[model samples]
Target: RPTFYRQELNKTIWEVPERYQNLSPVGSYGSVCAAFDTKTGHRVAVKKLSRPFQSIIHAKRTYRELRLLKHMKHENVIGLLDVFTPARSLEEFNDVYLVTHLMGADLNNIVKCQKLTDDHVQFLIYQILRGLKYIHSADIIHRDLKPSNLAVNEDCELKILDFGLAHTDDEMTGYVATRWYRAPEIMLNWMHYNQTVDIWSVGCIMAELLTGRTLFPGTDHIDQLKLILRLVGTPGAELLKKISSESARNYIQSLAQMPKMNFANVFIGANPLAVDLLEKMLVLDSDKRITAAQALAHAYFAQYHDPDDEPVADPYDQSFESRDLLIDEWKSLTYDEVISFVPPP
Candidate 1:
């Protein structure tokens, strides 16, 4: 049997105004509520890990999310404002509360608003790339990169969130990222995927922002592939051979050789440079896919790109890696990460 942590059940630590409803999206695994921080007079988002530690997998996710969010620091990465547990002792710690800055709305919400101009679209994608560039430098892959996970303010600034699905251990499986924003390599179960999988998602997000719609809103994996094929064309033999699933490869081969859509025709009325960058990211072969750093250097962002702020050196050498720890190890490690954690003053 596993030990359960109990808590004091204090919700008053953060002063949530009665007039406001939760701004942050709720969860399938856990719940998040938006609240006002009286201490600093700032709006904050609070997440409660749903039945965390009930299973080893859920426990691992909670552990990784807490650990990664606590360690990662970047202007475009969501900052860990504070972490609190109502419990007085670790043995009674049944819950985890993550406090983060409250954003105006998520990209998912913003994209639907269709209020962004060409400049806003380019800058939004730019912040995403900049954030991804930082995560990749630390040798982390945010396996789940979707609009909902990318929070934004009315100012059009973006910050990557939800590291719960991020892959620090290794390439696990296709179930990581959301299906709509999932990459072709993931759809085909091509385990050779790397940071470029995230780049593929960025491409999807770019298209969605331009059109105010999900580029590949597939009903299922097969349907998703079909949708992707129609837009970007089928993967050539080189990428097709990389697919581990025989049926998946056959599925691609079965399709008509789709002529890759011209970016101009596809992103009608969009800037030529914007279209070019999107094309580079949506490549079928992961290797051919543009990296976050490279995407940052793309001509589309030339007007806003700061020449002095070069991307961190391509840390392609995956010299640093971590394994998904066993339950006790995960719990033990999280103990320190939580105990030593200090909220931004």
Candidate 2:
């Protein structure tokens, strides 16, 4: 079970306002919530994680994610304000705190609010690629990348969050991302993998953003692979051989007899650039998969983005008054305090 904490702020601690006491839940994950600090008058988001079966592994993963966020600073990547590890009994067991700038809604919510034009989708994709490139350059792979994890603030700025599943190149793991967004290499259990898995998820996100629905709506793991094969074409023998595990190998064999498929017919009338970007990112061969930097350099971005246009201002800038409040006190408040500020049920 997950544990919740409420910490009172003192002069020695970061100054968060009491108004932010009980914010609302803005994320799909039940573990996340939005709160306001009455002292600082700033809104922030808080994430809590329960103790995993293996406490040591959970600790390591949480530590790694915090380290990665601390070192990673990018305009498109979500900024990390504060992290807390409880020193008391309650804190020692199942409590972890992560605070970030309060984004208005996620990409999934935005698409539902208003239809996205090709230009809007293209620009969003470019921003996502820019953020991913930064993570890749730092040797960090965001094992989980999905629409729900991509946040869009009131100013129209896009930020990528959720580094909980991220890992370094030397610390690769399998079955990391959601099944539909996972790459063929991961599903096949390839021993050698890298940033390409993130690209595959990016492709899946892009498709969904463009069509307002999931491209590969698979019901199960096998069906998921088939959906991928149907849109991106079947994996070749060389690709199948990469999976040395007997179980994985046998699964691929069973899938081989299925018919080949293509995306052109299914996504008819869609923007060519959208299709092109998806194909480049979803390539079966990891080596051929598009890199975040390469994606940024693609003509699709160049055609859609404007360099002269000033980027959107931070939405919370006026709300917080003191810019330092976001970097300092917002993170000091407990998750429950923030959840309490949520409008009453």
Candidate 3:
């Protein structure tokens, strides 16, 4: 049997295990809270998956995120420590809890709070790429890769979070939000995307880390396309032919021509190699963009890149994603997963 006590935060009740105490608030659109884990002697973020069984989509997303968290284990990837629910039976299984290691703050706060030197930026970028390499190797695309999704500690350690939006490369034809770091292909529906979309985000993030400003701060999707074109210029006829959407192709063709800006000029006084890597990463053509594995070996990360140290994961078991099951079936699977886990003693 499982044991838990109730705690209230922001008028929401949290029925958590006794091993997890000192309840505190952690930001997650208000669904996530934090607590100190007695078993691990570390702070952990407890995410309350709101109404996971309310809809098929919600349940699928919950299961997908849970499976990814359970399988992925890497230094720069967020670790899943535990999963629990207050329910005693299938009929009562309504809420799901995901526990993960908590960091001091996200990259957004870290980027906003203080200045980061080139060394700091390079190290942070290296870790991001290292983690990305593992994720890509596992055949997953973190559809939403933004500052808020990257967690960091005072020691300069970072981990990628929010696997709920991440999807396997097999089903890369979908949509996501968070515009500042979104790639042009995603915003315009240029074509089915692969892992390069994430490379574009890494470029945008690296640009922000270097200049302390958003590379593409567009007000809307159209504005985002314009902002990106203003820097990278319109995709020429060769690349424009790949657009699957007729209107999207016509829209870009009708846009005013803009010249591609030199990265050196845009990032003045920045390291030449840094500019080179950014230029490779932020390509308007996803096919031409530098991949995570290739980016790790870029001259910018020459000193820090260690081929032997960088690890990779086998392709994840994505068969579950294709399974069509009723709400009760998913609930049972979730329950089985939770009950199978034994907290460290």
Candidate 4:
């Protein structure tokens, strides 16, 4: 059953201040989101999780997200300002809300809106690596690393959002990430995998950003494996043997026997860096796959530049001391303090 906002906090719902009420719904996945003018005179995105499944496991995941966002402080990460869980009704159901700093667009939106220069794609990939590095360092894996989850501001600054599916290092599970962005090991039902899964998604996202199309968009699970084998070449007999599960091994072997297809020819005119990066990331062997840290240090990104003589700024540049200072200030403030600073109605 769908939950409605409590009467007390009803002002924050779809119809708040008339101006806020006029704010339209933005992009979302399994939730409703709205854009509003914050008291701090900034445009903010608010997400409301409706009746979120009554399961305790789901509730715990939601709570974990709240805790995770509270401690997260990084320029490449989307900032979560406050959480509002309205009181339950007689039916014991209530609405849940999360407030976050607004990003202008997502990678998909940018790709759709304009033609991407090689430099633009490289810059976006670099920022994603930086963000992933921070998340991995904290021992958290963003199980959902699709283009839709990546947010970008007008300045081309990127922020990774949507932690609802995130899991910590200690919480190893099978097949957590989205099907399209999932690593080969996950598809084989590897019960325990690490941050490398995210690197694979990064590779898919990088390819899409560069070519303005999905890298290996498959119709179904079997089709997805076929797509992977077609692009990266099928694993050898020995490699298939290591798949553990008979079902998975059989599936991989069957796909391996099919005709080979090369994506390089499909995207012949795309940037070399884009092709090289995709090749490294979409490899069949997860062990041979490139890490996010290594990808960031790749020469392709280090030497990337616009066609014009003007040098493009490094997305990882930390020399600007003021930016760090501003981030620190924002980090120091509590959720309540930040919300209180917002202009009152």
**Best model per lDDT:** 3
lDDT by residue (tens digit), candidate 2, 1-345: 123345533211222333447756555422566787554556887665544213444444444455455555678888666554444443333455667677768887887777878888888888888777767765667777887788897656798887645334423333333566777777556556787889988888888877777867676666677777766666678777767687877766776454545567666778887777777887877878878877776788877555443232221211222233321133332333323322211
C-alpha local distance difference test of each model: 0.72, 0.63, 0.82, 0.62
User: Which lDDT tens digits does candidate 3 get at residues 1-345?
Assistant: 658899779878999889998888766522887788898788888888777778777777777777788777889988678888898877777888888887668998988887999999899999999999999998898888899899998899999987535444433322323667877887656789888788889889999999988887776677677778888877788898889899987777888889898889999999888888888988888888888888888888877988999999967878888799987787788778777875443
- Residue 166 C-alpha lDDT in model 4: 38
Cα displacement (angstroms), candidate 3, residue 259, comes to 2.8
> What 10-residue stretch in candidate 4 is worst by lDDT?
309-318
Index of the highest-TM-score prediction? 3
Can you list the residue pairs that collide in candidate 4?
Answer: 39-343
Model 4 bad stretches (over 4 Å): 1-39, 48-53, 84-96, 164-178, 188-191, 256-266, 303-345
TM-score of each: 0.81, 0.71, 0.91, 0.70
lDDT digits (tens) for residues 1-345 of candidate 1: 112233223342222223223344433355666666666778877777767777677677777677677776778888788876655566776767777877767887887766778999889988988888888887788878888898887677778987636343234333333577878776556667777788888888889889887788766667777778787787777776777888776666777888787779878999888888888888877878888877777889987778576445233333212565566666666666777887675
Model 1's number of clashes is 1
What residue runs in model 3 are displaced by over 4 Å at the alpha carbon?
7-9, 27-30, 164-177, 342-345
At residue 127, give the lDDT of candidate 4: 82
Ranking under TM-score, best-scoring first?
3, 1, 2, 4
What global local distance difference test value does model 4 have?
0.62
Candidate 3 has its poorest 10 consecutive residues by lDDT at 168-177
Clashes (candidate 2): 16
